[PDB]
Design a protein around this ligand. Sequence first.
Ligand SMILES: [Co+2]
Ligand SMILES: [Co+2]
Ligand SMILES: [Co+2]
Ligand SMILES: [Co+2]
Ligand SMILES: [Mg+2]
Length: 216
Amino acid sequence: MLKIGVLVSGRGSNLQAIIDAIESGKVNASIELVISDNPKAYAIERCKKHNVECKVIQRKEFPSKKEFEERMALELKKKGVELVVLAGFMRILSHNFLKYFPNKVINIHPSLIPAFQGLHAQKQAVEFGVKFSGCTVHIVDESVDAGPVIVQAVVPVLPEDDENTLADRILKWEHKILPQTVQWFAQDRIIIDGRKVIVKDATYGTLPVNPALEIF
Ligand SMILES: [Co+2]
Ligand SMILES: [Co+2]
Ligand SMILES: [Co+2]
Ligand SMILES: [Co+2]
Ligand SMILES: [Mg+2]
């Protein structure tokens, strides 16, 4: 099975989606370790309920960021983690961490990047007034939600939508494209060429997900 590690900082609904997809047999992978930088994250409780190893590693426990990132990489390496998944993780990863997992660190972001990068992307979309938003699974690099794009899901925005209502609509898709991406990695179907990513034998040119979902 694909051995993956998940980094979290809060609620962790995206972690739950992966856990459920694995338990239902839709994703051929195992979560070898979950790392939370927040001791009170609900994500930790999810790990307890599903018997998923979880470790709390806090930034304040290290003088430098370099140390902090090194410890997290090492702990993942010790578990043979092949794919690192950020699910609600709030720290910014640098080359110190990324160099260990070349093109093997992914993240789920609630917007159609490069649009609305950064924090509160759903609220950004609503205040801006776009008619379409959505979510993106991308490879993490030194940019702020500007790395290689694996898959995106488009979601219509309503005139009366507020941050929470739109976020809720986008989240339904995040819970689908992130687990699907994990499965694609598990199937050795992720091909990288430059900053472009292609999924082997996947269906392209589709709505509302491109490439189209397969396990959902
Ligand atoms: Co273990
Ligand atoms: Co735990
Ligand atoms: Co983001
Ligand atoms: Co609208
Ligand atoms: Mg999450």
